[PDB]
Write a protein that binds this ligand. Sequence first.
Ligand SMILES: Nc1nc2c(ncn2[C@@H]2O[C@H](CO)[C@H]3O[P@](O)(=S)O[C@H]32)c(=O)[nH]1
Ligand SMILES: [Ca+2]
Length: 104
Amino acid sequence: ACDYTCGSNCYSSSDVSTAQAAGYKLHEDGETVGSNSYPHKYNNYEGFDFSVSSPYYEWPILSSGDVYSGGSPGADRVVFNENNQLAGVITHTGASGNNFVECT
Ligand SMILES: Nc1nc2c(ncn2[C@@H]2O[C@H](CO)[C@H]3O[P@](O)(=S)O[C@H]32)c(=O)[nH]1
Ligand SMILES: [Ca+2]
C-alpha cells in the first residue's frame, strides 16, 4: 500500500524522507538545482491546512525513485519547512493548470 498516492504515483515514507533530506540539504547550503530553482519557496496559495509552520519549501519527488538533480521535475513535490518538518506531499495531477492538490 502507498503512504502517499499522487495520481498514479505511489510513494512510501522512505521515498518522502529521502527526497526531503536532499531538498533540505540544498536549502541549508543556499544552493539550487534545475531551471526552476529547487528547492524554492512554496507560498501555499492553495491554502492547505498544514500542521507545521511556514515558511514552506517545495522539492520534487520522482516516481523513478531517484533524487531530483535537474531536468523535468514531474508533477509531484514534497513540502517541508525551516525545521525540516514535513508539511505534506502535493501534486499537479488532477489539479487545474499549475495548481496543486494533496496526495492522498
Ligand atoms: N500553485 C502554486 N504554485 C506555487 C506556489 N508557491 C510557489 N509556486 C510556484 O509557482 C509556479 C507556478 O504554479 C509553480 O511551478 P512549481 O515549479 S511546481 O513551483 C510553483 C503556491 O502556493 N501554489
Ligand atoms: Ca519507492
